């Protein structure tokens, strides 16, 4: 193909490499799934070794790991801290509660899955999913944003 197309593809690879090697989650959790999330932070699995480091403010966050039961009282707050994240942001639902309500699906005060509130990039199943499974979801998200072709789509526009 064109020489400029190759340059654009390599720039896409570089941008995707940077964004997948530096994934900072918001220090945000709701329940037992967030307990497994800090067990992923624990020395056995070392998200920091993978380059994944928690940041407290949503402004410095890249991904949002919805780890727990999203209730009706919590949903505006979750939407607010999602909206306050800057644009290259991703969402990892974790556990059956955040996926589709889970054990509290038919409850009066539970949002039936956080995908009703925020656009979810990756769903991690389990109750709780193990820290292995959450780490697998993080690596799958890294592959997904490695697959992104933003500058190539912009060039083909």
């Amino acid at each position: 193909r064109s020489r400029a197309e190759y340059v654009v593809t390599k720039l896409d690879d570089l941008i995707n490499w940077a964004r997948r090697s530096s994934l900072w989650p918001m220090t945000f959790g709701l329940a037992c799934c967030a307990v497994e999330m800090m067990h992923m932070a624990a020395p056995r699995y070392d998200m920091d070794r993978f380059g994944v480091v928690f940041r407290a403010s949503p402004r410095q966050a890249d991904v949002m790991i919805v780890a727990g039961t999203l209730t009706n009282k919590m949903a505006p707050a979750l939407r607010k801290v999602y909206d306050q994240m800057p644009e290259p942001r991703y969402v990892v639902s974790m556990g059956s509660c955040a996926n589709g309500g889970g054990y509290y699906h038919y409850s009066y005060s539970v949002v039936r899955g956080c995908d009703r509130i925020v656009p979810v990039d990756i769903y991690v199943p389990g109750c709780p999913p193990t820290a292995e499974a959450l780490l697998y979801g993080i690596l799958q998200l890294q592959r997904k944003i490695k697959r992104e072709q933003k500058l190539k789509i912009w060039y083909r526009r």
């Binding site: 939407r79 801290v81 909206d83 306050q84 800057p86």
Partner: protein, 115 residues
């Protein structure tokens, strides 16, 4: 001239970094994106309201102590004087007076924070 040049180079470097940081990435800003952060909820009141200061007396004391520092700072040239006895006595008096003021404020609980 060299110091001015390197200061200007630092200024240009940081301005270039913040300029490329603001003009390089894709912009998508809306109202909820740029609303202020209050841990997920709306702020009850503006952050420009008065915000009480419990160490105001310590800050005023810091002003006076900083001027005591400014008085004490010509000592490395003062020790070169011919009359070292006068300089030594005056420096001792100054540091002792400063220490007595600190001790009096400590006794009168000025270093403790209000409420």
């Amino acid at each position: 001239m060299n110091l001015y040049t390197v200061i200007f180079i630092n200024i240009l470097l940081s301005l270039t970094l913040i300029l490329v940081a603001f003009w390089l990435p894709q912009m998508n800003l809306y109202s909820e994106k740029a609303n202020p952060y209050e841990c997920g909820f709306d702020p009850t009141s503006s952050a420009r309201l008065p915000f009480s200061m419990k160490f105001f007396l310590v800050a005023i004391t810091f002003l006076l102590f900083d001027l005591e520092i400014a008085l004490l700072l010509p000592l490395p040239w003062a020790i070169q004087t011919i009359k070292t006895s006068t300089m030594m006595i005056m420096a001792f008096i100054l540091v002792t007076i400063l220490s007595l003021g600190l001790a009096y404020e400590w006794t009168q609980k000025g270093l403790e924070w209000t409420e």
